[PDB]
Amino acid sequence: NEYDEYIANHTDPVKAINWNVIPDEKDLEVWDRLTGNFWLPEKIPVSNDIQSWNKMTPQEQLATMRVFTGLTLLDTIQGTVGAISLLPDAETMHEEAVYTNIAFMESVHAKSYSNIFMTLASTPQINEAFRWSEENENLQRKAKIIMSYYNGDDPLKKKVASTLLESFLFYSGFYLPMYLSSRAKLTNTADIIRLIIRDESVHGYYIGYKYQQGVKKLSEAEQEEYKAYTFDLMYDLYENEIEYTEDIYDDLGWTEDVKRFLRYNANKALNNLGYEGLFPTDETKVSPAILSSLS
Amino acid sequence: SNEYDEYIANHTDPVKAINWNVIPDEKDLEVWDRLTGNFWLPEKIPVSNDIQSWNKMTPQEQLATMRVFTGLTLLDTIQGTVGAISLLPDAETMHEEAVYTNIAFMESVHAKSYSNIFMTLASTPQINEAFRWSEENENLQRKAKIIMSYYNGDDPLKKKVASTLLESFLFYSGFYLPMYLSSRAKLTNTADIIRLIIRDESVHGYYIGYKYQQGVKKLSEAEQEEYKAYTFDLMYDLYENEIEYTEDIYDDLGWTEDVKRFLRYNANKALNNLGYEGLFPTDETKVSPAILSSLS
Ligand SMILES: [Fe+2]
Ligand SMILES: [Fe+2]
Ligand SMILES: [Fe+2]
Ligand SMILES: [Fe+2]
């Protein structure tokens, strides 16, 4: 009887998913792509990076620990809160299934950074990197800005925040292993980062597509409001990311190229949402060597 | 000012990144490793090799198969997109939250597997009728809504009891069929998919039940008694409903009595996963050897 009330408030039949009928073809395409790309960090021999790691400066090692812990924080949030927050607003049952894959793969991504750390770093290094992630104002601000939308009640805003996280927020951290890879350092770790990017690229394209489908149902007036909100939010995350990037890379001296990479990915994120870039292309000229290391 | 400022000002604790170098409950790592190491997709099993025994099967056997499988699909659809997801907020550890994201995804894989089996063996009219039967069947909608009522409620421990009864008991009236058929070298590739599904469900039920046990042992003496009463009462309510579902699916075929013994067998296993003694005397759980041998 305790559940009688619920049965009375939910009278429509509960549906089982049928994959023999796909209302939106992109849901099957993405499900197949993402599941076809399943991987676990154990598949990559990060151990072969220890000589490279041991030749990295104390400073190089520190920046690496910090960027990876900030990426870990973002995957933790996207896996346990972000992807899950999109379920209620799904247009199809297949899309709900895709989000369960995205949630799990985000957990795989987050664990990957620990695999890298348990292979290369010392316990004190790991402890200090996680403490740093808790105390860093810029990392905590970007995390809380995104969480504020996941915990809010606007479904389209959750999608914008999720796409900006997947197609923009991770990039200030992805630069480091890509830069290092193009200099033959941490090359095995970079392969893990490449598998992560292979997933995030799809996640951002997909969720951005679902945002577009959703926003297109609104009046021209409402659409301009959401576009303005999106650009305003991207501007804010970009300003916060600039500070985060300066503190991480200034010492190493890679800052200016990382900022070009930030503008490059900010535009790609907005393109995933159906919008033009925020930055003129001439302001997005990150090193082509970094771009080719991504693939 | 900013839309998000209030939120930020109300959440001063740092957001924590999962750290797999510090694991408060070693069971979370054990289960993560077992479940991820057991990853599979239905396309990796050669279901097409079952076309012959399928087309050798009787209309009664095919109908029961379609309906049993759509009923299992419905349970996996709910567990992946509603149930596992509901357990996340109450997790004791971050590693437990990660395990639940794996369970959610694998439940979606399980649900999809039945569509792979149907697309390989059945006709489109058979598939459409089975999904329509699933939406109309009172016993199936009832078991689904009873479990969903707890996932959508606000009591963490009841979500875990409901999940464990779903994973260790509610799927069994349907798993009986492929185990029986494979014992007759029929739909053997399909049975292999079912065994991969059980390999997962048995670990999910053990794990969520373990979490329930840890959580309930923390409560007052009176609350522990209330939760035990709640668990046996929900188990019996689900059992009585499952008896009706089972008779309607299996009476024509005449497998009903053996399926009911299998229900009692698994009901006890589900209760054990929650830390409780079985509800059914062992003498009432003498499932046929063929079935127990086919599971293995
Ligand atoms: Fe990720
Ligand atoms: Fe992602
Ligand atoms: Fe399942
Ligand atoms: Fe399960």
Resolution (in Å) of the shown entry? 1.6
C-alpha dihedral, A10 to A16 to A19 to A22, nearest 10°: -20
Tokens 């063929």 map to which residue?
B290
Q: How many domains does chain A have?
A: 1
Nearest CA in chain B to A4: B146
Radius of gyration of chain B (CA): 20
Tokens 């963490």 map to which residue?
B156
Point out the residue among A76, A143, A152 whose CB comes nearest to the CB of B18.
Answer: A76
Distance CA A174, CA A157 (A): 25
Ligand-binding annotation for A203, yes or no, is: yes
Around B284, how many Cα atoms within 13 Å sit in the side-chain half-sphere? 10
Q: A35–B41: do the CB atoms touch at under 8 Å?
A: yes
Distance CA A204, CA A168 (A): 9
CATH at B28: 1.10.620.20
Q: Answer for the pair A184, A129: CB distance below 8 angstroms, yes or no.
A: no
Ligand-binding annotation for A243, yes or no, is: yes
8-state DSSP, A275? -
Point out the residue among B16, B118, B153 whose CB comes nearest to the CB of A20.
Answer: B118
Ligand-binding annotation for A282, yes or no, is: no
Residue A79 Cα to ligand 2 middle (Å)? 8
Q: Choose among B16, B19, B102, B96: nearest CA to A115.
A: B19
Q: Answer for the pair A104, A79: CB distance below 8 angstroms, yes or no.
A: yes
Min Cα–Cα distance to chain B from A287, Å: 30
Here the tokens at position A57 are 């400066």
Q: A80–B74: do the CB atoms touch at under 8 Å?
A: no
Output the DSSP codes for B103-117.
Answer: HHHHHHHHHHHHHHH
Q: Choose among A191, A215, A193: nearest CA to A274.
A: A215
Query: Which long-range contacts does B227-231 make (Cβ < 8 Å, 24+ apart)?
Result: B227/B157, B227/B161, B228/B276, B230/B158, B230/B161, B231/B161, B231/B271, B231/B274, B231/B276
Distance CA B208, CA B165 (A): 10
Full residue range of the structural domain in which residue B226 is found: 1-296
Q: A7–B146: do the CB atoms touch at under 8 Å?
A: yes
Q: Answer for the pair A287, A201: CB distance below 8 angstroms, yes or no.
A: no
Q: Choose among B292, B276, B188, B186: nearest CA to B225.
A: B276
Q: Which of A3, A6, A99, A113 is catalytic?
A: A113
Distance of CA A173 to the CA centre of its chain: 10
Closest ligand to the CA of B74: 3
- Tell me whether residue B114 is one of the annotated catalytic residues: yes
Point out the residue among B104, B134, B136 whose CB comes nearest to the CB of A103.
Answer: B104
Helix/strand/coil percentages in chain B, nearest 5:
75, 0, 25
Distance CA B121, CA B230 (A): 42
Here the tokens at position A151 are 């915990």
Output the DSSP codes for B34-48.
Answer: HHHHT---GGGS-GG
Ligand-binding annotation for A200, yes or no, is: yes
Total Cβ atoms within 10 A of residue B56: 11
**Residues of A with Cβ-Cβ distance to B8 under 8 angstroms:** 141, 144-145, 148
First and final CA of chain B: distance in angstroms? 63
Q: Answer for the pair A169, A241: CB distance below 8 angstroms, yes or no.
A: yes
Binding-site annotation: residue ranges of B for Mn(2+) = 76, 107, 110, 167, 201, 204
Total Cβ atoms within 10 A of residue B283: 8
| Residue B151 host element (H or E) | helix B138-151
Amino acid B99 reads V
Residue A164 Cα to ligand 1 middle (Å)? 12
